[PDB]
Write an enzyme that holds these catalytic residues in place. Structure first.
Site, short mmCIF file in Angstrom:
data_model
loop_
_atom_site.label_atom_id
_atom_site.label_comp_id
_atom_site.label_asym_id
_atom_site.label_seq_id
_atom_site.Cartn_x
_atom_site.Cartn_y
_atom_site.Cartn_z
N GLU A 95 -35.21 56.61 30.10
CA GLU A 95 -36.13 55.41 30.07
C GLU A 95 -36.33 54.78 31.31
O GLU A 95 -35.38 54.40 31.91
CB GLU A 95 -35.81 54.51 28.72
CG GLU A 95 -36.70 53.59 28.54
CD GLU A 95 -36.08 52.34 27.51
OE1 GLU A 95 -34.96 52.17 27.47
OE2 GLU A 95 -36.86 52.02 26.72
N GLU A 100 -43.29 44.38 27.10
CA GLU A 100 -42.09 44.39 26.26
C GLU A 100 -41.76 43.03 26.05
O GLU A 100 -41.72 42.37 26.86
CB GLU A 100 -41.04 45.17 26.96
CG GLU A 100 -39.68 45.02 26.42
CD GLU A 100 -38.75 46.11 26.89
OE1 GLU A 100 -38.94 47.18 27.46
OE2 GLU A 100 -37.59 46.10 26.45
N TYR A 133 -38.84 52.30 34.19
CA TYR A 133 -39.49 50.91 34.47
C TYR A 133 -39.93 50.75 35.79
O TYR A 133 -38.95 50.89 36.55
CB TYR A 133 -38.75 49.69 34.14
CG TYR A 133 -38.30 49.39 32.60
CD1 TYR A 133 -37.38 50.38 31.94
CD2 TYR A 133 -39.26 48.56 31.81
CE1 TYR A 133 -36.96 49.95 30.64
CE2 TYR A 133 -38.72 48.34 30.31
CZ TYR A 133 -37.76 49.24 29.95
OH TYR A 133 -37.16 48.93 28.39
N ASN A 156 -37.36 42.55 19.36
CA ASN A 156 -37.46 43.46 20.40
C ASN A 156 -38.78 44.52 20.08
O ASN A 156 -39.02 44.81 19.07
CB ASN A 156 -36.45 44.41 20.64
CG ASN A 156 -36.25 45.15 21.86
OD1 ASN A 156 -35.48 46.17 21.97
ND2 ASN A 156 -36.96 44.96 23.11
N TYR A 165 -44.21 51.99 32.23
CA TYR A 165 -43.01 52.36 31.37
C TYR A 165 -43.22 53.65 30.77
O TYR A 165 -44.38 54.20 30.30
CB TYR A 165 -42.80 51.12 30.57
CG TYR A 165 -42.09 51.58 29.04
CD1 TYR A 165 -40.54 51.43 29.22
CD2 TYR A 165 -42.28 52.22 27.86
CE1 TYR A 165 -39.75 51.45 28.17
CE2 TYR A 165 -41.64 52.39 26.99
CZ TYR A 165 -40.27 52.30 26.97
OH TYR A 165 -39.58 52.36 25.93
#
Ligand SMILES: O[C@@H]1[C@@H](O)[C@H](O[C@@H]2CO[C@@H](O[C@@H]3CO[C@@H](O)[C@H](O)[C@H]3O)[C@H](O)[C@H]2O)OC[C@H]1O
Length: 189
Positions: A85, A176, A87, A43, A76
């Site tokens: 968080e 990502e 997006y 990740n 992001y």
């Protein structure tokens, strides 16, 4: 290639984070450009933009995005107090990040409808340490790897739906990946 961390390059803030698994290289280029090359990664999230972001920035991105597996290309960033968080997903690979998430609305911006969702991370890494926090998503229906994102349309639609943001922390155009391969070359402004 660079060391995971944050800083400035050619006038732009950057953030590059990974889970330590290996298989990903992140490179800062001229101006607002960055590149990512990954093969059987873990990740990771990397890209260029601003620290702090704003709630009315118009963000331009352009380039190539070639994931092979699970990956996103998005505006992001994070807010603090509350920790969120967020997006604005412009493209993705094998996985739509909203799969199984509850739809909380729609917003039309910059040539496409986007669907809005809220998810939750539990005991996961964040800008303030391991934490439980919500994530906000706008997922573009018409995928692309260049364009303009009027962030205010998203933040305003989220707030309308009860998805409120606190004080903005960083705000980037990010590639990502989650255990995938790919390449990408993106220029921000
Ligand atoms: O040293 C600390 C850095 O490691 C820390 O970086 C943040 C760690 O969390 C990352 O967010 C994950 C990105 O991937 C998503 O799929 C997950 O939901 C998130 O958990 C974030 O990108 C990094 O900026 O920042 C604080 C430093 O002390």
């Amino acid at each position: 290639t660079i060391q995971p961390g944050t800083g400035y390059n050619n006038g732009y803030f950057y953030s590059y984070w990974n889970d330590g698994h290996g298989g990903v290289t992140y490179t800062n280029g001229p101006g607002g450009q960055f590149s990512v090359n990954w093969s059987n990664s873990g990740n990771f999230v990397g890209g260029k933009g601003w620290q702090p972001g704003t709630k009315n920035k118009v963000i331009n991105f352009s380039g190539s995005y070639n994931p092979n597996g699970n990956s996103y290309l998005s505006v992001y960033g994070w807010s603090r107090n509350p920790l969120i968080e967020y997006y604005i997903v412009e493209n993705f690979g094998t996985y739509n990040p909203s799969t199984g998430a509850t739809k909380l609305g729609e917003v039309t911006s910059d040539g496409s409808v986007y669907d809005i969702y809220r998810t939750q991370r539990v005991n996961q890494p964040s800008i303030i340490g391991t934490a439980t926090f919500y994530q906000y998503w706008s997922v573009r229906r018409n995928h692309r790897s260049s364009g303009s994102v009027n962030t205010a349309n998203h933040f305003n639609a989220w707030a309308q739906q009860g998805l409120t943001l606190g004080t903005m922390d960083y705000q980037i155009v990010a590639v990502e990946g989650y255990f995938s391969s790919g390449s990408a070359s993106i220029t921000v402004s």
